[PDB]
Amino acid sequence: EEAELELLRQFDLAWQYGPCTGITRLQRWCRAKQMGLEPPPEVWQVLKTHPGDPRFQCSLWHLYPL
Amino acid sequence: MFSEQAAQRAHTLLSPPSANNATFARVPVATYTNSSQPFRLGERSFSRQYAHIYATRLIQMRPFLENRAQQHWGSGVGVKKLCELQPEEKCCVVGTLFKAMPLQPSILSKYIHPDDELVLEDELQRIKLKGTIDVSKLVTGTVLAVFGSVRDDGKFLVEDYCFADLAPQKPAPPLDTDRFVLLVSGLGLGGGGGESLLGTQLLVDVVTGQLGDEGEQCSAAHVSRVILAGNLLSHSTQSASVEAVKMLDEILLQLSASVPVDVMPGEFDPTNYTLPQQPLHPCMFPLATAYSTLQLVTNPYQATIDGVRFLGTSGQNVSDIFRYSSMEDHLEILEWTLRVRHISPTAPDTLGCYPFYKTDPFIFPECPHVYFCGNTPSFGSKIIRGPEDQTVLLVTVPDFSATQTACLVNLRSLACQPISFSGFGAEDDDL
Amino acid sequence: GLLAFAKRRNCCIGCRTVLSHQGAVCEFCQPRESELYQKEVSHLNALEERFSRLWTQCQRCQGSLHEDVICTSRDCPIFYMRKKVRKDLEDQEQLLRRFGPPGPEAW
Amino acid sequence: ADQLYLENIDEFVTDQNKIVTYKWLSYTLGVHVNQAKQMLYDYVERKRKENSGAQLHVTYLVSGSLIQNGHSCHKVAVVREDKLEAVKSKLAVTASIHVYSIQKAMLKDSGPLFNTDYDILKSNLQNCSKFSAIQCAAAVPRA
Ligand code: SF4
Ligand SMILES: [Zn+2]
């Protein structure tokens, strides 16, 4: 923790995985894996050792009335 | 085809009564498969934004255009991203169009104007385009490859450009005895004349087996299916619609007695507005839901009718392209839609759709044997060829309220013949 | 405070009578149901047409068609008029699921 | 036998002053459709050979192929009593001729010939494939 919260914030702004501020984080991870762009096997291995926490399993701007 | 065989016998009906009159049987429909499952929407969550659709469209359409620009311009390839371009160097770019037209209405008849620009756009930035390219034949939303160089004013000079093209097509088995399929569109129940009433009556009387001699009754017994394609209730003004569903229920009862029927929603029909239109709710048809020969489908309809695979719409993509382009011929617009590998490229920018996010479903994944359209103002049909062994029959279905014309498609020779109905009017040839 | 402790009583679409069970129509106003389905699907149809004209206008005012919109401009009517149609559509879509589905979906 | 439907038609047409299509005369007397067309042709031939000056008007149906501009279409028309032979000579192939209706006093357009068939359908709604030449098998009330 506090290092796992920057890896996800770095996965969320890389443009080669998609334009993602409307959906979940694991849905975008599996969308890129289907098309197989290059999802890395570390943004998966922190979404498995946690429960349904809203500060891991949510996009950066999931507040913010946009 | 049909009217050739309809005279192949003897004529009995200008005669006094007899002991027996012949009867027949409807031909079996021993193979059918609906494969329109990507258009049936079970979850239907809104609250996304329209940027997930363009991104997956580009990501899926990119290798087709790379693989065609290789064999269309030589394997000494120069394909490059839009940011890595050096001034005055020959390269190929794969991107998405955006047509910048004024006179397109904002929130607060054709719409093409003598000045309007094209812009090639990728995920990161844009660039303007001039040179040898058509300014008014192309529409916003087409994905294409292009050849040229970055000039000094930041613009781009285009020499030639290529589209995605036709998809592969497996061959169909040949048939033994010819089966026919009837296509109708746009009855317009609610307003549109009284000659349309006798035309609708004569049409259902011919197909059900009430009219004509043993020739017509032998030939209408071979018609295997009936497809009704959109715009069933033409409406004069919304703000009438309650009394029309009663008559549509009666007509679908009189057709569900003999044939199998498939019913599709249209531009005015009680469904949603976005483009994968969902089937009609059965609570508006009390009488016709007694029989299991009536079926209710959606907008984009696929099927596999006796080996031959069909795909069609109710004519909402073709008229949308007709609004914001310069082409007039509806058969040509249908073939152009086939050429860019997308059923409706102007969506979403001037034709609304659902906000998908996993995969764009309007990209052709295979090639259909028949490909029809909806409520077009006149009949037309054609055969086109692919680069590989790919042949496609293209039909435009007329509108019944004005022309009173339907289409018969043979399933063994793969040809289309018009059928027209006309009772006599207030006609007196002595004035 | 108290607003969270809802019971969410269902109501008849025809004559507004609260009752046990989830069916949309009332037993006295059950026959007239095709007309009550006809009514309100022409409302869902007009909310669908308003969602799409607004959420693609932000894409042309922003410049790009491939990246997210971030503009909370308090002097634009576009902002917060694009926020309420999501909820109107959320509500009007759920009122029509009182009626069954018009077909299967797992075939 | 013959006098049965001959007198029935002679009281339906000339006394009650009605308009008799073949489908009305097959829902009244419970007859097959082709036999009803043959009945109407029998009546018109008898009463047009007897007298030649009756108060009797006929309307027929002509169907068959045609070519307008290359393409082969199939034209089906409900025609009056004056214009039959010209419509027959415009066509290429002929495929169906029978009788459609008879009248007492002449109409102006094809207006009431839909009203009659519609109204006799309106009360007779559980049977329309009853006197039909084509009898399918999978269409029986199940759902
Ligand atoms: S909310 Fe209004 S100002 Fe902001 S991008 Fe949309 S249209 Fe433009
Ligand atoms: Zn009630």
Side-chain angles (χ1 to χ4, degrees), chain C residues 11-16 19 24 26 29-30 32 36:
Chain C
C11 287
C12 180
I13 296 184
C15 64
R16 302 157 154 157
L19 93 144
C26 168
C29 48
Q30 185 64 60
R32 184 183 53 116
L36 287 183

Side-chain angles (χ1 to χ4, degrees), chain A residues 15 19-23 27 31 35 37 66, chain B residues 47-49 51-52 55-56 59 123-124 357:
Chain A
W15 86 107
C20 309
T21 77
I23 61 186
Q27 282 171 313
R31 176 175 76 175
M35 300 177 297
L37 294 160
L66 59 93
Chain B
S47 81
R48 276 169 271 275
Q49 47 191 354
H52 296 270
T56 306
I59 289 165
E123 58 187 1
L124 293 175
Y357 86 99

Side-chain angles (χ1 to χ4, degrees), chain D residues 42-112:
Chain D
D42 198 2
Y43 173 79
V44 71
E45 207 201 331
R46 292 265 180 90
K47 299 280 183 170
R48 281 254 181 105
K49 189 72 215 312
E50 155 188 355
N51 193 276
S52 87
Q55 269 60 37
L56 199 66
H57 299 158
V58 287
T59 50
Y60 309 79
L61 183 137
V62 193
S63 173
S65 175
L66 199 43
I67 288 173
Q68 295 169 353
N69 316 70
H71 45 267
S72 52
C73 87
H74 189 172
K75 180 75 60 57
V76 177
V78 177
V79 198
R80 266 170 168 233
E81 86 280 355
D82 299 333
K83 299 105 197 164
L84 168 84
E85 292 291 271
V87 170
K88 208 169 301 180
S89 45
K90 281 200 164 184
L91 259 65
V93 182
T94 319
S96 176
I97 302 165
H98 59 75
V99 182
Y100 199 83
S101 277
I102 55 174
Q103 208 182 357
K104 259 287 284 181
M106 179 42 69
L107 45 85
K108 300 299 121 185
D109 44 336
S110 295

Side-chain angles (χ1 to χ4, degrees), chain B residues 9 76 91-92 126 195 320 370 381 388 396 418:
Chain B
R9 286 181 175 89
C91 41
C92 171
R126 303 193 286 122
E195 264 279 357
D320 196 59
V370 193
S381 177
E388 283 193 42
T396 79

Side-chain angles (χ1 to χ4, degrees), chain B residues 116-190:
Chain B
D116 43 359
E117 297 180 278
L118 281 307
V119 171
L120 187 69
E121 175 159 351
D122 205 320
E123 58 187 1
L124 293 175
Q125 69 249 30
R126 303 193 286 122
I127 202 167
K128 295 227 165 312
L129 291 190
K130 73 181 182 191
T132 51
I133 200 160
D134 216 336
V135 75
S136 41
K137 202 222 183 198
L138 286 95
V139 298
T140 166
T142 318
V143 53
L144 82 169
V146 76
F147 195 44
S149 292
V150 181
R151 266 197 50 163
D152 309 61
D153 44 355
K155 292 215 203 319
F156 195 102
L157 180 88
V158 164
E159 296 154 357
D160 56 333
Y161 56 93
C162 80
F163 295 132
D165 232 66
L166 302 197
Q169 177 181 322
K170 306 175 311 173
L175 293 189
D176 46 7
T177 317
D178 50 345
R179 331 206 194 186
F180 290 82
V181 157
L182 185 86
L183 281 146
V184 198
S185 294
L187 301 151
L189 303 154

